[PDB]
Amino acid sequence: SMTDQAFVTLTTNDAYAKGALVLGSSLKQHRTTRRLVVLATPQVSDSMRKVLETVFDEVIMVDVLDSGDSAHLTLMKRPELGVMLTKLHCWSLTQYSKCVFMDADTLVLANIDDLFDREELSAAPDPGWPDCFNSGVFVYQPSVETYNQLLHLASEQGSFDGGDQGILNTFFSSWATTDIRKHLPFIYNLSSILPAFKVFGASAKVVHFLGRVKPWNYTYDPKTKSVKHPEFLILWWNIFTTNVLPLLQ
Amino acid sequence: SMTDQAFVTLTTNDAYAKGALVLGSSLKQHRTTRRLVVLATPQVSDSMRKVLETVFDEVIMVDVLDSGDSAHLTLMKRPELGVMLTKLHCWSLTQYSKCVFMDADTLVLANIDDLFDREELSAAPDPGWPDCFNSGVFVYQPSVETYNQLLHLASEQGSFDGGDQGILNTFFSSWATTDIRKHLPFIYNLSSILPAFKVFGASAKVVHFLGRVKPWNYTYDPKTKSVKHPEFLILWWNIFTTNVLPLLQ
Numbered sequence: 001s002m003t004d005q006a007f008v009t010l011t012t013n014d015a016y017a018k019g020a021l022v023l024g025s026s027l028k029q030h031r032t033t034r035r036l037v038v039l040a041t042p043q044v045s046d047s048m049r050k051v052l053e054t055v056f057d058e059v060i061m062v063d064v065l066d067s068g069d070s071a072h073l074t075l076m077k078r079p080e081l082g083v084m085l086t087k088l089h090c091w092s093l094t095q096y097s098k099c100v101f102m103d104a105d106t107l108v109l110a111n112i113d114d115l116f117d118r119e120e121l122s123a124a125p126d127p128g129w130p131d132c133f134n135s136g137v138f139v140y141q142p143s144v145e146t147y148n149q150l151l152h153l154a155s156e157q158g159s160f161d162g163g164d165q166g167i168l169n170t171f172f173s174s175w176a177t178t179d180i181r182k183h184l185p186f187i188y189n190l191s192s193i194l195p196a197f198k199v200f201g202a203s204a205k206v207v208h209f210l211g212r213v214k215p216w217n218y219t220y221d222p223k224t225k226s227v228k229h230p231e232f233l234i235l236w237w238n239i240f241t242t243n244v245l246p247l248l249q
Numbered sequence: 250s251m252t253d254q255a256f257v258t259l260t261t262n263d264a265y266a267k268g269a270l271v272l273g274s275s276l277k278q279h280r281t282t283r284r285l286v287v288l289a290t291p292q293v294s295d296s297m298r299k300v301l302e303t304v305f306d307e308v309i310m311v312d313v314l315d316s317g318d319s320a321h322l323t324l325m326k327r328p329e330l331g332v333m334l335t336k337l338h339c340w341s342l343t344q345y346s347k348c349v350f351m352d353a354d355t356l357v358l359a360n361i362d363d364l365f366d367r368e369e370l371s372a373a374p375d376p377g378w379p380d381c382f383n384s385g386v387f388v389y390q391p392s393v394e395t396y397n398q399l400l401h402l403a404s405e406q407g408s409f410d411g412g413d414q415g416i417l418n419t420f421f422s423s424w425a426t427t428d429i430r431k432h433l434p435f436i437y438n439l440s441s442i443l444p445a446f447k448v449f450g451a452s453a454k455v456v457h458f459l460g461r462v463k464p465w466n467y468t469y470d471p472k473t474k475s476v477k478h479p480e481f482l483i484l485w486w487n488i489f490t491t492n493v494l495p496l497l498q
């Protein structure tokens with residue numbers, strides 16, 4: 001296998017854990033040759049970590065509240081940024097030479113191992129402000145150096161919405177104007193879920209359920225096989241019910 | 250002056266004419282050294298053309314209903330596409346070596362003559378599907394060849410929404426993946442009118458009132474100096490009342 005490269009996702013709770021299980025299961029379904037990693041916190045229940053270990057190759061515990069954690073000092077300056085400081089540990093994974101970070105609210109529809117042809121920092125434009133890249137799917141190179149610099153920036157600048165996108169766009173500020181090969185096609189992070197979707201949505205590789213209501217916040221009804229287009233939402237729930245639930249033997 | 254280069258806009262009626270007057274007036278305010286051109290149709294009233302001649306250097310009449318018009322045969326195949334076939338005449342203006350097309354629902358906030366450093370086809374990403382460029386602001390090279398090919402594509406493919414963006418994106422299909430210098434910064438076509446705008450909206454060069462309701466569809470009240478943020482909307486109306494109305498001596 002490519003033991004040197006991984007898909008890396010994050011969950012700080014049992015709800016986003018359901019996302020990660022669907023993401024990981026979807027990467028396996030499309031036969032990734034790379035490792036699957038999930039960053040998890042002590043807020044994820046032991047019982048959920050046991051399920052995550054059935055999908056992920058590594059469940060890596062990160063606890064920013066631990067005084068021995070690399071991000072703990074930054075957290076005392078910015079106590080509102082625990083989730084994003086947890087996310088930033090993706091750069092601490094120096095056992096890998098290259099990774100694709102994916103949000104736990106994403107879902108893979110095709111093999112996307114060709115993302116490992118890209119260099120740090122390759123990412124898709126954010127709908128709404130497309131000179132910024134969306135931080136939900138990105139190719140990067142773990143580095144303690146880069147990690148510490150992102151921590152400093154988080155300390156200095158903070159994050160109005162608690163997300164990492166501003167910080168990552170501030171650090172990787174040449175993305176908009178430099179090297180078109182670092183622009184991932186939008187189909188690798190399809191996040192604006194009429195006429196553009198009717199022509200190109202069929203070729204989506206990754207769906208991103210960006211925004212307030214996540215697929216797992218819906219109530220699924222087996223009797224109608226529907227939540228109470230929801231095309232993508234139905235596919236999420238199809239993977240969950242078909243591929244995830246039976247991992248619980 | 251740069252008699253060889255122009256800003257080119259379009260109006261097929263008196264309502265969008267008000268847009269063009271505000272756009273043209275804004276380009277003059279920021280001291281363009283280029284020519285100002287408006288493509289107009291016989292549906293624009295003579296009285297409005299007289300006002301347009303006070304702002305524009307050239308009011309160029311285009312009538313796709315005239316059997317001598319270059320786009321007339323295409324219109325008989327696609328009678329629903331009169332406006333976009335009118336727009337496509339922007340490529341017939343071979344008296345200019347290079348032009349910036351701007352929609353009549355745009356407004357300039359700074360000198361943007363440095364767009365003439367760009368090559369065809371340079372355009373900003375469309376919010377919502379950012380691997381397509383928005384066809385409301387673009388750098389191009391007039392050519393009868395290119396014109397005829399866009400006409401053919403319009404004939405072959407049509408336009409579901411009546412706009413030209415699909416056609417232009419189909420013809421200039423390498424835009425997303427090739428030559429980052431052909432990606433205009435989003436501030437040259439700021440069309441998604443909270444946190445990204447709070448950091449970068451102040452540096453906007455062009456505002457685009459993309460979507461259903463246009464600034465001139467609002468009712469302005471002098472007693473409150475408001476329509477019945479609307480920051481951009483207020484600036485539109487400020488240019489209209491301050492700079493446009495008094496051109497009517």
Ligand SMILES: O=c1ccn([C@@H]2O[C@H](COP(=O)(O)OP(=O)(O)O)[C@@H](O)[C@H]2O)c(=O)[nH]1
Pocket residue numbers: 009010011012013016083087102103104105106136163209210211212
């Ligand atoms: O309470 C939270 C909030 C977010 N996340 C992680 O952070 C990512 C970014 O958050 P989200 O996708 O909700 O942001 P959006 O994509 O909606 O802006 C998620 O996918 C998760 O991987 C998490 O683990 N716990």
Ligand SMILES: O=c1ccn([C@@H]2O[C@H](COP(=O)(O)OP(=O)(O)O)[C@@H](O)[C@H]2O)c(=O)[nH]1
Pocket residue numbers: 258259260261262265332336351352353354355385412458459460461
């Ligand atoms: O009836 C019309 C519709 C559109 N236009 C022109 O076509 C451009 C594109 O239309 P619009 O800006 O309304 O499309 P949007 O930017 O909202 O998608 C306008 O700015 C005008 O220049 C026109 O002259 N008459």
Ligand SMILES: [Mg+2]
Pocket residue numbers: 152156
């Ligand atoms: Mg510093």
Ligand SMILES: [Mg+2]
Pocket residue numbers: 401405
């Ligand atoms: Mg043909």
Ligand SMILES: [Mn+2]
Pocket residue numbers: 103104105106136208209210211
């Ligand atoms: Mn997300």
Ligand SMILES: [Mn+2]
Pocket residue numbers: 352353354355385457458459460
């Ligand atoms: Mn427009």
